[PDB]
């Protein structure tokens, strides 16, 4: 009867949308996609070395869908976690900014988010149209 | 004598001091107060800092 991404489970939508972005093959993943730790609190690079970048692009687009607008500073606080600094206690550490900025620029070039008044980036005309189509397919997976 | 007071005092405990007794130990500079710990406790009532809970 008409569905949005708010009626889809988050993990099951992000996995399904990340596969769709890779199947299209047009996202311009950076050349540094296999070197980077993605945070200074992390220890090791992402394990899924081929498609970890498509999962950030899917996760960020849903996040912009659910919010009004965000910028690369709000994404670094979101995707960062506690850092083990050895003998001293844990603390929150923001994530890597270059990755989030490249994700947002890739999404603008595919034309799914757009630059916004009041700063940040809002979701676009085609953004709502395209997020909701994969949102429709994810409900009807169960045979 | 051009070297008399020539060392810079722009940060740290040497620059700031109490405005009542000119000490450097136990200074309170919250809300721009600039009064030592012991001096503030004797005249917190006059400033308007009462002790409720």
């Amino acid at each position: 009867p008409g569905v949005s991404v708010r009626d889809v489970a988050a993990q099951d939508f992000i996995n399904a949308y990340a596969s769709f972005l890779q199947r299209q093959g047009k996202l311009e993943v950076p050349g540094y996609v296999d070197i980077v730790k993605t945070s200074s609190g992390n220890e090791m690079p992402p394990q899924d070395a081929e498609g970890w970048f498509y999962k950030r692009a899917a996760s960020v687009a849903r996040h912009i869908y659910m919010r009004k607008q965000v910028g690369v500073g709000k994404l670094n606080k979101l995707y960062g976690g506690a850092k083990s600094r050895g003998v001293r206690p844990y603390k929150h550490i923001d994530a890597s900014g270059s990755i989030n900025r490249k994700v947002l620029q890739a999404l603008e070039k595919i034309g799914i988010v757009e630059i916004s008044p009041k700063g940040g980036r809002r979701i676009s005309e085609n953004g709502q149209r395209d997020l909701d189509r994969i949102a429709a397919q994810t409900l009807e997976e169960d045979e | 004598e051009n070297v008399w007071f020539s060392h810079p005092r722009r940060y740290g405990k040497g620059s700031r001091q109490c405005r009542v007794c000119s000490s450097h130990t136990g200074l309170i500079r919250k809300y721009g107060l600039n009064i030592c710990r012991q001096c503030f406790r004797e005249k917190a009532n006059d400033i308007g800092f009462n002790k409720f809970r």
Binding site: - | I28, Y31, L33, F40, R41, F49, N50, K51
Partner: protein
């Protein structure tokens, strides 16, 4: 007429509420639209000194508080009656500022 705003700030509840009451009482003595007193959240300013001079004894701590109460009233009035109502209600302990527009 002109759009005005009167902001009140004090550390005394009893001395502030009656001043705002005089403001609104003069506001409907000669009637005009109120946008009456919107009380902002009270600010508690805490200073936590230790207790003492020199550190002998049990490590006992004090906390001192100053409470800042703030209220603003958004009035509109002719230019004449602005000055008199801003000058009559002047009381010690209460800081009044008036924003022109």
């Amino acid at each position: 007429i002109i759009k005005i705003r009167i902001t009140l700030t004090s550390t005394k509840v009893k001395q502030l509420e009656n001043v705002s009451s005089n403001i609104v009482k003069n506001a409907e003595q000669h009637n005009l639209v109120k946008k009456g007193p919107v009380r902002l959240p009270t600010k508690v300013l805490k200073i936590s000194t230790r207790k003492t001079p020199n550190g002998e004894g049990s490590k006992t701590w004090e906390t001192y508080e100053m409470r800042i109460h703030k209220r603003y009233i958004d009035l509109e009035a002719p230019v004449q009656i602005v000055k008199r109502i801003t000058q009559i209600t002047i009381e010690p302990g209460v800081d009044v500022e008036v924003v022109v527009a």
